[PDB]
Amino acid sequence: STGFPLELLTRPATERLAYFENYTVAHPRLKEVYEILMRTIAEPAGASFIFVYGASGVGKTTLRLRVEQKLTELALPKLESDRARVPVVGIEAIAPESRYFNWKEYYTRALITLEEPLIDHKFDYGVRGISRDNFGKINVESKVVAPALRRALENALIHRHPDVFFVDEAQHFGKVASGYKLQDQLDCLKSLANMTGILHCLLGTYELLTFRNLSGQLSRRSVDIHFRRYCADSPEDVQAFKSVLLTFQQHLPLAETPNLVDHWEYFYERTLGCIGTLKDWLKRVLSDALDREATTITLKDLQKRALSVAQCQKMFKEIQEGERQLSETEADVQNLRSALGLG
Amino acid sequence: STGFPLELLTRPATERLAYFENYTVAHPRLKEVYEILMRTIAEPAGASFIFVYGASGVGKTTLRLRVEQKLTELALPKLESDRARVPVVGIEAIAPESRYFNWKEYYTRALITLEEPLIDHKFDYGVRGISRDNFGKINVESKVVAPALRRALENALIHRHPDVFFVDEAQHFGKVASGYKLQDQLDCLKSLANMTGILHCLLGTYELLTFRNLSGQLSRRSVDIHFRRYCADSPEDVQAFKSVLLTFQQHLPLAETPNLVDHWEYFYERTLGCIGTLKDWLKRVLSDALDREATTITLKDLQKRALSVAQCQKMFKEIQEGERQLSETEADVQNLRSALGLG
Amino acid sequence: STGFPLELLTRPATERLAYFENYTVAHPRLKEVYEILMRTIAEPAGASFIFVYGASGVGKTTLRLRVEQKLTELALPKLESDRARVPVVGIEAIAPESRYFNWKEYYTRALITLEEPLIDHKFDYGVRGISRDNFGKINVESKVVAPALRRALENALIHRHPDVFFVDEAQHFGKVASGYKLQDQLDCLKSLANMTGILHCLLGTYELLTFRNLSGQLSRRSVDIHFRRYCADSPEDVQAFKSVLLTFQQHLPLAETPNLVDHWEYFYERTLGCIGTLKDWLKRVLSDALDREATTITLKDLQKRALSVAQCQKMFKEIQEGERQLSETEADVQNLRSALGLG
Amino acid sequence: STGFPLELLTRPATERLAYFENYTVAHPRLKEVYEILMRTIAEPAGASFIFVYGASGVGKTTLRLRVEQKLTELALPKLESDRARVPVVGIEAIAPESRYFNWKEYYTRALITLEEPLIDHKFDYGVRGISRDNFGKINVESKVVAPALRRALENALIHRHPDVFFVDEAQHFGKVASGYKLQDQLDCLKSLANMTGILHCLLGTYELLTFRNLSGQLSRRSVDIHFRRYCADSPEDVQAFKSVLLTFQQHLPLAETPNLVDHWEYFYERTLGCIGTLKDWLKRVLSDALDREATTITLKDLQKRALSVAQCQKMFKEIQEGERQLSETEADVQNLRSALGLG
Amino acid sequence: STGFPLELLTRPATERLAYFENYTVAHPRLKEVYEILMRTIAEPAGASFIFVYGASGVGKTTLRLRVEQKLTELALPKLESDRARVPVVGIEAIAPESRYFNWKEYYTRALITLEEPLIDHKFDYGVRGISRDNFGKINVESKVVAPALRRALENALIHRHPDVFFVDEAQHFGKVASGYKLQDQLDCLKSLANMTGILHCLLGTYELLTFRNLSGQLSRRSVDIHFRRYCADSPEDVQAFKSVLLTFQQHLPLAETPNLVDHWEYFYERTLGCIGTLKDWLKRVLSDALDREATTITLKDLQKRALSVAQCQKMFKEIQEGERQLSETEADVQNLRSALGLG
Ligand SMILES: Nc1ncnc2c1ncn2[C@@H]1O[C@H](COP(=O)(O)OP(=O)(O)OP(=O)(O)O)[C@@H](O)[C@H]1O
C-alpha cells in the first residue's frame, strides 16, 4: 500500500500518534537540498562555512538530523577500524541573556557536546581547568578564560576531526552591540574553522542573510544553500505541494481517509508552503481527532488548530524579504561581466 | 439543591466566607479556553509558546491552577509509577527593581520551584555552585553566573520533562532597556524551550501583546489563545453574564437570597464582564454583610465596595486597545490570500 | 465630666502636657475612614494595594497607629495559642540620598521590622548573609544582593503571614528618572505583594496621586480611600469642625477653660480642615501658656505660634489639586455608560 | 607526457582525488612573488616587516607552505652541524572574540608553536610561569601577565633566531577599539621585532592595506609584496590564465580530457582570476563527476559548484578598491620629485 | 686605496656581504652630531635630557652604538682601576600592547640591562623582591610593585654611576590616553634622572618632538641635537651626498665599480638623503648582484629593491612637517628680545 498500515486501527491512539510523528515524507526541495549538503560536506575543498538558509517550516532541523544519521552510518564501517574519531558533532546556538552573544558558553557547550565518546578515548585537553570526572562528563570551571576554552576546543577538534560541525539556530550569532562586531563574530568563526580545518554548517532562518556577504575572504569560503519553500505562482511547486498533501492524507491513520487536496488553498494560506508547518498542523488535527475518536477530519478541525492570520502575515513579510535578497537574476551576471570587462 | 447548602446558616460567618472563597463558577468562556489550553498542552507539535491574553479581573490564574491540578491528577498514575517526574511546573514572573529584567533571578527561581521532589531523587546538577542542603532546599550562591544557572536549569528540565511550563504575568518580560531587546528576550526564552523540549506557556495581561508577533520563527512556535471578556453588544454574552450572576446569587450563604440579576447594568459597568472582578465585588459585599450579620444584600452595600469610575475607565482603555489589536476579521484573510496569490 | 480631670491642676506642667499629647480626639471623618479601612483590610479579596490619600494635616499616621493597635489587640488570643505569627507590620518609605529609590534599604528595613519576635522562632532564612546574632538582632551583610534580600523578605512574609503591610509616607517611591520607571516601581510592589499574598496599604500625601491609575492591572488590584479634609462649603463639615474644636477646648488641662469657638474662622484659615494641624497648634499654644504658668490663653498666643500665610496657601495649592483629581462626579458615571454601551 | 599519469584511471576515486588535491601548479605571478619573497627573506637589510597583500584565492597560504619547506630544506645541511636554531616559525593571527585583539593569546601561542623541538633543547626561559611538561609541550599558566610572556618570547626568539616569523591571516590585527590604536598595534609588533632582530612576514587580504604606510618609521622597515591576480584588460594575464586552465584540464584524472579554454570567460567570471578559488572549484567538480563515475566534466557541473554571483560581485568590489590603493603611476613619481625639489 | 680591498673578489659572497655591512662611512653631518653629543656627554651642566631628533634613516642607532663604544674604550683605563662602574648603559623603549606605557616593564628592563656585569659585584639592592640567581641573571617577581622597582633602579644607578642612559625610539613614551599625560611621563623621566644625577639621552623619530618644550622646567634642563638629513636646495649637502655615494661605490665588493654619480637624483629621491636607508638599499642590491654573480649593479636592480613612492611620500610628509617645527630663524629672535624688553 501507499499509505499507513491498516493494522494500526486496532491499536490505541498513542501508537497511531507516534507512527504519524516518526513518519517523514520526501519532497523534491528536501531531497535536492540534502543532496547539495551531502556533496558539499563530502568535498568541502577549502570551504569552512555552509550557510543553510530557509524559512520556518522548511525542515532545517530534520535535514540536519538526517544528514547526521547518514554520516554516522557511513562512517561506522571505518569507525570499526579507526577510533578516536567522531563522524559529526551538532550543537545549537544559544540566544544570550545579555545584549551580546557570549562566547564562553558557546565554547564550553561545544566542548561538552563534542566530547561524549567512550571513556577509552583519552586526550588530556589543554589548560588545567578542563578535565574528565567519575561520570564521563566534561568538567569546565569558571576559572578558565575564554581563550583557554578556545584553545582546548581547538585541540579537541583537531584530535577528533569531525567531518562537519553543525551549528543550529545560527541567527543567534547576530546578538551584538556594534555593527562591525557582526562581521567580527564571523571572522572569529572563520579563524576557528581555519586553525582546526573543520567544516562548519550554519542552519538558520532568513535573518541569517545579515551574514551573507561581508569581507571577500569570508565570502570565498562560504557555500550558500537555499531551502526554498513551495511558491504558489509556479504550477510545478503547486503540484508538488498537492502531492505532499495527497501522501499525507494517505498516511493519516484514520478509519476514513479525508479529502485534503480539495482545500489545498487553505492549507497553503496557513502554511505558506512550508512542509514542517503542514506536518505539525496535521499532527494537531490528527491528535484532536484521535482524542475525539472521530473516524475522520473536517475543515472545522483544521480551523481549530490553524495559524492566525497575523501570525502568517508576519511570516510572509520575512519570507518575501529573504527571497528578495537571495534572488539571483541573469541581469546580475551582466553587471558582473560588465564590471570585469568581459562583456 | 442548586444553591448553597442550608446547614451553613447555623455554622458561623468564617466558614461561610471560606465556602464562598473556595467556590468556583463555570462559564462558557472559561471552559472553552480551558479545553483549548488542555488540547494545546496535550501535544505542542513543534510549538514552544502559548500566549494567553486577557483583561485583569478575569480568571487567568484560576485557569492556570485548574490546569495544573487536572494534569497532576491525570499524570498521577504515571507519577506514582515512574519516579523522577514532575507533571507541571508553574512559575510567575518577577518585576525587577532595576530597569532590566533579571534573568539570574528567573533561573534561580525556576531551580527553586522545579526541584522540590522527595529527597531520594539526586542529580548533583552541573556547575558546582548549586547543591542540596540538610533541609532539602536548593542552595544557589551569588557566585554562580547566569549562564551556569541556565545550563543547570536546562539539565533539570530535560530530565524531569514537565508537560507544560507556566510563566504567569509574563508581561514583566518587557522591562528592558533597549527597544529591540524585546525580541532578544523572547529569543532567549525560545532557546531555553528548544534544547529542553519543554512547552512554555506565557500567562499575561494585554501588555503582553508587545511580544505577540516578533520575527517569523517566534510566530511559528507560538499559539494565541484569547481569554475574551463578556462583551455587551452581543446578546449571548449578556445572557451568559446574567446566568453567571444568577449562579453567584444562588450560592450566597445568606438567610435570604438577594435578587441580583436585576441590577446587572451596574455590575457590567463596574466589572466590564470579567468574572474575577465580579467575584471580588461579591466577596467584599458578602464579607461586609456577614460582619453586620444582616439577613441579605442591598445596592448600598454594593456601592461601598464598588470600583471607582476613574480606575474602571483606565481598564476599559487598556481593554479597548488590546481587543482592537487582537481582532482578526475576514478582511485580514483577503490580503493574506492576495499577497500569496491565492485570491 | 466630658473634659480633663481636675486633678491634673496640682500636677506639674509636664504631666498636663503629656496628658494633652497622648489624648486623641475622634471626628466623623476619622471614624468613617477607620471603619472603611478596617472593612477593607479585614479581607482584601484579590486586592493588593490600598491608597489612603490625604493632606499633610489630617491624621494618616495616627490612623495607622490606631489600626495597628486594634489588630494587635484582636490577635492576642490566637498568638497565645499559635507562635511564629505577627498580626500587623508596617514601615515608612525612605527618601533616598541619591536620585533613585534604594530598594536594598527598603527590603532590609522591612526584614528588620518584620523579624522582631521572641528568640524561639527560628526559620533559618535563605541567603547566607541573613541570620540572627548574639543579641537577637537580624544582621544584613552589604555583600547580599538585592534579589536575595527580596527572596528572604518573601519567605519571611509567607511564614509570618501578616494581616496587612503598612507603607507610610509612600510618596517617596516616586524618586525616579524615567517615565516608565514611575510605573515599574509600583509593578515591583505588586509583584512583591502577589508572590506573598499580603495586602499592601500605602499611606501618603497627595503626591501619591501620581500612582493613582497606571494600566488596568494596577487599576483593578487597588482600592482608593480618600481622607478628605473638613471643607468650609459643607455646613455639616463646619459643624463637625466646631464640635472637634469645642472638644479640644474642653480637654485643655487649663485652670480656666477659654472660649475657643469664637475664632473658628481664624482656626480654619490656619488649618483649612486638617485636624492634626489644629491639634499640634493647640499643643503649641497650651505648652506656651503653661511655660508662663498663666491661667489662660489669648488670641495673640495663637497668633504667636500659628502657621504663616506663605506656607498655609501652599498646602491649599496641593490640596485643591488632589481633591480635583479625586473628584468622582455623575458625569463620569454616564461617560462609562456611553463608552461601554449601557446607556 | 605533460598531463596526468594515465595509470590513475585504474585507481579508485580516493587516489585520484588525493592526486589532484596535492598537485601544485606553477604560474608566472606565483613564481615572481615567490622569487621576490625569497630575495627579501635572504637579507632583510634593516627591515622587520614583509607585507604580502593578496586577494581571496591567490595562494598566500600555499606560498607560505612552499617557502617554509624551501627554508627548512636550505637550513637542513647546516642544521646537522648547528643546533639551537629553527629555520622558520609559522603562525596565523587569531580573530578575537572581544572587540580588541588579544596580545596575551598571541604571545602564548607564538611560544607554543615556536617551542616544539626535540626534548634535548632546554633554555630555562624567563618568568616562572612558563616551563615544559611530561609530554614535552610548553605549559603557560593563566597568572602570567602579558609583558612577562613578551619577555619570554623575546628570549626564545633571540636564542633560536629563526630566519623569518610568519604571521598568517594578519588581517585580524586590525580588530581594535580606538581609531589610532592601529599605529600602536603595529609599533608593538615593530618593538617585538627590533629586540630580537627577527624578520616578520604578515600575510593577509587586501584589507591589510590599512597597515601599509600609517607611519614613516614603520614605512621604512616594511616591504610591500603584491600577490596580484590575473587581470582581463591586459591580454598577457588573459593568456596566462588560459594556459593555466589548459594545464589544469590536462592533468584532471578523468577518462576523457575535458575542454575548458572555450569558457575561459565563464571560469574568469566565477574566479576573478584567482588561482586557489579555481583549484577548489575544479576539485569540487572532479569530486562530483567522480561520484557519478562520469568520464568527463559537463558545463552544468561547473554551474553546480560555482560560487554565487553575489559572492563574486562583492569580491571584485573589495579587490578593485584594494588595487586602487596599491596603484603606482608616473604621476606619483612627479609629485615626489616636485615635493623633494628634484624637479 | 680609497676603495674596497681587492682580494675580496676571490672570496665567496658571504665574506663580501659581511665586509659591506660592517663597513661604516663618515659624513659631515654624522661627524658634527657625534662631536656635539660627545661634548654634551663630557659635561651635562645641569641638563638632564639629551633630545636627539632624526628621521628614520639618519643613523641614530649606529651613532648611539659608536658613542657607547667610544665611551667604553675611554673608560677602560679607569675601569681597570675602579670596579663597579659601568661606563654607558643603553636600553630600548617598548611599544606597549595596551594604550598605556607600562612603566613597570621599562623599570625592570632597565634594571636587567644595567645589571649585567660579572657576578663579583654583590650590591644588595633595596626592596626584598629583587635579587640575583644561580645563573647570574636577576629575577623580579610580579608581586613587586613598580615604585619599589623604581627605587631599586635609583639605588643601582647611583651606585654604578653611568655617564649616560641611552633610550632608543623614545617616542614610545607618547602612548597614553590622557592629553596632559605627556607632561606626566616627561616629569617622571626627569624625576628619575634627577636624584640619580644621570644624563638621560633620548633618540627617536620626528614624532619625538611632542615632548620638545612641553614645559619650562623640562625646556631648560634639556638640550636638543638635530640629526638633519641631506637636503637639495643647499648645494653643500648635495655635494656631501655625492661624496658619500662615491665612497659607497668605491667600497662595493664588485669586479666593476658602478657609476652611482649619474643617478644621484634617483637615489636621493628613493632615500631622501638618509645614509642608513641608502646603505640598506645598497645592501639589498649587492646581495642580489652576488646571487646573480653579476660584476655590476644595473639600474633596474636598484628599482627592484627600492622603496615604493607611497612609502617615500609618507617619509617626506613627516620629515617636512617636523623640520618647520625644528626651524629657528632670526625672526624668532627679535620677538624674544622684544618680549623680554631687551630690544
Ligand atoms: N520532510 C519532513 N517530513 C516529516 N516531518 C517533517 C519534515 N520536515 C519537517 N518536519 C517536521 O518539522 C519539525 C522539525 O522542525 P523543522 O526542521 O521543520 O523546522 P525549521 O522551521 O526548518 O527550523 P527551526 O527549528 O529553526 O524553526 C518536526 O515536527 C518534523 O516532524
Ligand SMILES: Nc1ncnc2c1ncn2[C@@H]1O[C@H](COP(=O)(O)OP(=O)(O)OP(=O)(O)O)[C@@H](O)[C@H]1O
Ligand atoms: N470562574 C471563576 N469562579 C470563581 N472565582 C473566580 C473565577 N474567575 C476568577 N475568580 C476569582 O478571581 C480571583 C483570582 O484572580 P483572577 O484569576 O480572576 O485574575 P486575572 O485577572 O485573570 O489575572 P491577573 O492577576 O494577571 O490580572 C479569585 O478571587 C477567584 O475567586
Ligand SMILES: Nc1ncnc2c1ncn2[C@@H]1O[C@H](COP(=O)(O)OP(=O)(O)OP(=O)(O)O)[C@@H](O)[C@H]1O
Ligand atoms: N483625630 C486626631 N486627634 C488628635 N490628634 C490628632 C488627630 N489626627 C491627627 N492628630 C495629631 O496629628 C499628629 C500626627 O500627624 P498626622 O497623622 O495628623 O499627619 P498627616 O499630615 O495626616 O500625615 P503625615 O504623617 O504623612 O504628615 C499628632 O500630633 C497627632 O496628635
Ligand SMILES: Nc1ncnc2c1ncn2[C@@H]1O[C@H](COP(=O)(O)OP(=O)(O)OP(=O)(O)O)[C@@H](O)[C@H]1O
Ligand atoms: N598554485 C597552487 N597550486 C595548487 N593549489 C593551490 C595553488 N594556489 C592555491 N592553491 C589551493 O588554495 C588553497 C590554499 O588557500 P590559498 O593560499 O589559495 O588562499 P588565499 O585566498 O591566498 O588566503 P586565505 O586562506 O586567507 O583566504 C588550497 O586548497 C590549495 O590547494
Ligand SMILES: Nc1ncnc2c1ncn2[C@@H]1O[C@H](COP(=O)(O)OP(=O)(O)OP(=O)(O)O)[C@@H](O)[C@H]1O
Ligand atoms: N654611517 C653609516 N655607515 C654605515 N651604515 C650605516 C650608517 N648609518 C646608518 N647605517 C646603517 O643603518 C642601520 C642602523 O639604523 P639607523 O640608525 O641608520 O636608523 P634610523 O632610521 O636613524 O633609526 P631607527 O630605525 O632606530 O629609528 C644599519 O643597517 C647600519 O648599517
Ligand SMILES: [Mg+2]
Ligand atoms: Mg527546525
Ligand SMILES: [Mg+2]
Ligand atoms: Mg489573576
Ligand SMILES: [Mg+2]
Ligand atoms: Mg501624619
Ligand SMILES: [Mg+2]
Ligand atoms: Mg589562503
Ligand SMILES: [Mg+2]
Ligand atoms: Mg636606526
